[PDB]
Amino acid sequence: GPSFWLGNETLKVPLALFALNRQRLCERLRKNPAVQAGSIVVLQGGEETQRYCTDTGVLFRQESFFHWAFGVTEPGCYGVIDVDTGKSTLFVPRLPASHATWMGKIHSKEHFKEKYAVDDVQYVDEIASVLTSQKPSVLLTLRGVNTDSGSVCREASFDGISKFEVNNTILHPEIVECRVFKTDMELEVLRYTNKISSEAHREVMKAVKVGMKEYELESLFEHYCYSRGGMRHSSYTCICGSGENSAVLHYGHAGAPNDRTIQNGDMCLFNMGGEYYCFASDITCSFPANGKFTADQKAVYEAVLRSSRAVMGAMKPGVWWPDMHRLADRIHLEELAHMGILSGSVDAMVQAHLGAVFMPHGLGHFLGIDVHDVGGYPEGVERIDEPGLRSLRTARHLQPGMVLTVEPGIYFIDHLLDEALADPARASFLNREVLQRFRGFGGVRIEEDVVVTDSGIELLTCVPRTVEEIEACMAGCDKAFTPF
Amino acid sequence: GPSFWLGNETLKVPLALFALNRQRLCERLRKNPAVQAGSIVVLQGGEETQRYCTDTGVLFRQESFFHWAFGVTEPGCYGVIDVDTGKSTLFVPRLPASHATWMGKIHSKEHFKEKYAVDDVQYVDEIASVLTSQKPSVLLTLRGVNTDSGSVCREASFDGISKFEVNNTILHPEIVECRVFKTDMELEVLRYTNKISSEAHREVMKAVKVGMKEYELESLFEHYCYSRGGMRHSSYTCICGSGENSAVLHYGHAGAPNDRTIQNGDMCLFNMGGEYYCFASDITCSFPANGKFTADQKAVYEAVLRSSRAVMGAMKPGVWWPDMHRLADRIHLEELAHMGILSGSVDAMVQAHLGAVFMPHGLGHFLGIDVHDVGGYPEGVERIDEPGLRSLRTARHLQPGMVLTVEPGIYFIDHLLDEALADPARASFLNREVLQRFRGFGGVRIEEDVVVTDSGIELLTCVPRTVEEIEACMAGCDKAFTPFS
Ligand code: PRO
Ligand code: PRO
Ligand SMILES: [Mn+2]
Ligand SMILES: [Mn+2]
Ligand code: NA
Ligand code: NA
Ligand code: NA
Asked: Does the keyword field hold Calcium (chain B)?
């Protein structure tokens, strides 16, 4: 069958990937006792957008559920799936003649049918007529709440949909559940996104020099990913935190835009991941700007390396993700105590939620077509109302086929440290005089992407991780990849 | 005063630039008869967005009118200007404590006052109270139609605005008019955007090799612009058209995503422009993929070079922009005839609108904070209802301070050629035996950015342009070129 490919050494992604997703969705819907025979799934793709009121086009990136089902890159499409037969129909815009001048070839419907390996292709303006002739019992549309954004998924609509019976409740939990479990074809894509992003992280580690701006490495990362990987998009805005900025979890956005000069003695925390054909990667590397860990940097870094590998070593089916988060907290506390930042009973520190002062985010999250992938909190799975754990993006137990980030970190965040020092239940553990030295340190995060297997995990990421490996990487002369 | 700067060799942009824009807007409004004492201009900044229903943040780029007035890079702001006094107040979001963990320092209002050199800073939720205390006669908000997109500008609104008198008709044409005329401080920024984008285009010409994907050069261009220029955004999606894709005017979008392999013998048409602090650039370079122009390529290329230079030489205050478009059309037709593609009377060709077959877009457009900048068709300026000319993004007369692209091109577009061949009024001019050779050629576009001055123009762009200069650049021989004067 056909494949998506951006040539050179980029990955060929078979369109059969999306056919399998459609089949899996139908199989799941058929088993749902509420689903009527003759149902049709109706999804609406993303549309082209512009900046504000201008004609400045925004580069189009497909809506994630639509992509998962169809792999379609063009704006303005719809797609439907007959549940009982699995038959797929793509609806594409009927373009005006002037499109050939301004935008490119006006492809035939047959071109799209071949390209996407769907059963039929029709024009968008005929959607009501086509669906009417199919005589469906009900249209199943997409509406639900994303548990990371709190946004409501946009339900498909078209002129004449009011003449059909529409259900917008059944589909969302079923298609979400399908997305939670990655097929072998999807895993091949995620191995590739991890491979390219890993290579780009290594190039960044080799290129970092004291005196550079953070954004110079953002630029280099994205250039490697696009030119060598065919990754036109990143999975999220690059986080290139140097010095104290490494304590800011989503640093790099427009309000704090990777604009600090990297200084001798800084730690760097670079959390970046290219996106290929709407599939994510999400990797964090932490390292000294000057290529040599100080004693304090080594101690904090190796604490996080310890939790990283302890969590990865414990992960397997049946493990409760919140238990892995707590495992990381306990390790961090043990190590911070060894360093002299903390004193006293680690059991008591855990009871006082001290771990969350140093790791005020979730241990990690599902990853797929979105970096914070869907399905972390389906109905019946509750968010734990405690510091740190409440920021977990899933409280599920692990099962084969899930893809997770494993991203423990330790940070020195003044307002959290100050709150802890004011609370007698936590202050007794904190040694102010030692902690003082780490004010402004920033933090360390080590983030791998892994797949749960029948017996454990498969690690997708491949970057240097021990202190020696990182120092050796940064000292290498190779000068492969030299723009200009 | 304070400046925006991204360090290294990037441009320091004084925040005084935006203060001057506010002053100019107030000065214009004070002379406007529809404007009464005690009016306050109220603008709403852009807000943070995410991809669809996900939590994947989209990188925030400020709304252009708001940027022009305030230069503010943060999402969620509003800004007001007292017309009578010129006093400026910026409203910034009141952030949650958790912002300090996830997003960064929760800066004080005073930090923002100093950063932006405004007269006062307040929190957004206090806007109704703050405006109430000022007892304004009327709030002047933004609403109008963009003449390139057809979209309606987003008018400011806040909880309690219904208790004020609001006028949404006065402001738009006035702030648009201010934007049309660039200040010296704005020209400094546009000189810089052109400098960086020109350097990037030269790096791309040096790097292009047969067998590369078009997108490899998009990537290299954007990397030069960001890493060396501090340009986090491009002004528009890069157009990297090789071979027949060079005939597709806005090639490179998601439906045609710069994914062709460049072949020996192809022409390349690369239309790319970095954006710095929301100021545009827009440059097009055309060149042979293999670094050596064939005779046919040289002929088409030099025809567009001739029109480019003729227009730049004729541009000065008082010139009607559609007359420049017609000049380019006439030159293209003359040169296509000199190449044997066309024969007959060029006057007759012009009368039959044959130029538009080969250049089915406008000669050029205003440029500023938007690549297709505002104000090309103010009330009373009409679109010319002819092929080619109807795509002009302005029909105004040139005046000092305007910034224009000059972007003639010649393309070989099958459905347009075939229409002409089916039209007795046009068909006899075309020599099919020669034209057949140019089917699939794509096209050539040569685009400079210029400022209208008292004397003529100031050319902002600095890239190789003659065949000899381009061939030298591609061979690695950079800077071996002299700009037009
Ligand atoms: O948002 C999250 O869940 C993780 C935490 C560190 C950065 N990304
Ligand atoms: O849109 C326009 O007006 C010009 C034409 C060629 C590319 N940009
Ligand atoms: Mn992550
Ligand atoms: Mn242009
Ligand atoms: Na990018
Ligand atoms: Na992360
Ligand atoms: Na252009």
From this structure: no
